[PDB]
């Protein structure tokens, strides 16, 4: 509803409730992750080769085809599985 | 603004443990193309003229 003959001074810069919305969206972003899956067994040595592609030596492939040992649902047996990652998500640790 | 990844990907499930699934990339079905965006040239020049004004 509209208020007649009234004048209030505002300030968006010293305003509150942008602090509240920032804190609440950060915490609410965090609270949708507690049921989710931690990638503890995936921190592992990745044997990465280039993606199957016509490689140009001047440019770079932005995808690496990485194979690795993955633990299976049984705690005895492990498997070998491959995946595709980006350059920005993997780094080379110091031939092979 | 329009924005796209034109690469057709294959989500592949990997069993980590009991009730633990990792969704990895499988195949790249087709061409390996670069993700990009488009804006209109004319309306962006128009809005830059407005903001300079």
């Amino acid at each position: 509803i509209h208020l007649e003959n009234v004048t209030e001074e505002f300030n968006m810069w010293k305003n509150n409730m942008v602090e509240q919305m920032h804190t609440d969206i950060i915490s609410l972003w965090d609270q949708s992750l507690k049921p989710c899956v931690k990638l503890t067994p995936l921190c592992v040595t990745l044997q990465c080769t280039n993606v199957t592609n016509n490689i140009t030596d001047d440019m770079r492939g932005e995808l690496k085809n990485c194979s690795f040992n993955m633990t299976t649902e049984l705690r005895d047996k492990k498997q070998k599985v491959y995946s595709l990652f980006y350059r920005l998500d993997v780094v080379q640790i110091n031939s092979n | 603004i329009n924005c796209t990844r034109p690469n057709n990907n294959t989500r592949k499930s990997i069993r980590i443990g009991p009730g633990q699934a990792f969704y990895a990339t499988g195949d790249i079905i087709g061409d390996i193309r670069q993700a990009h965006c488009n804006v209109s040239k004319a309306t962006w020049n128009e809005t830059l003229g407005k903001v300079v004004k």
Partner: antibody
Amino acid sequence: QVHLQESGPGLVKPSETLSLTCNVSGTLVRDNYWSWIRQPLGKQPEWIGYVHDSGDTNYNPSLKSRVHLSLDKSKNLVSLRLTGVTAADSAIYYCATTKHGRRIYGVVAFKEWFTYFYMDVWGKGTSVTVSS
Amino acid sequence: TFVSVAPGQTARITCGEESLGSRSVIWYQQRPGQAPSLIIYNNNDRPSGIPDRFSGSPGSTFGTTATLTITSVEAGDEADYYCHIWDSRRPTNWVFGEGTTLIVL
């Protein structure tokens, strides 16, 4: 009317630089691209390479070091030179005029296109028959 | 490799690896004792001099094999066909595809 006309030795001795020249028919050597294509008996052909003036000197990654394709613009001929004739080199060889094109599948500014090459005419032949 | 139909019938000639990216297949034919002749230079184009019904495959299709659909064959078309694909993902193939012959009854 365009055809071709090869010329070579016929009887080939090993451990020797080999030579071939390709005469023209109407179309001059300066204008169009050129190519050499070899084929054994009862086999699929093996494209030796395409050559042209001004840096267009892309060859086969099978050899990369023992072949030299060029032209003879003083005579309006095409020239191929080879090094190290072996038993696999016993094949009939062809000159050709090739042409190109573009196959575009994405943004042209992102270099998302490649060039094909097609040989519409073909040669007549010269048999490299290795004998020692 | 042979395709044996009556002269005047339909025929297909597959050649090579399954597609990975945007191909540009190029088809040739070999007369015996002569240098070859081009028949197809784009995915489904044809130049002047060779007639129609060398219906190639659409090379913008992913996970397919380059065919060569020839309806109403004849003895004058008898040669050794050759695929020569230009896959966008795989590198440049310098040798041609294998000799896919044709005999006619």
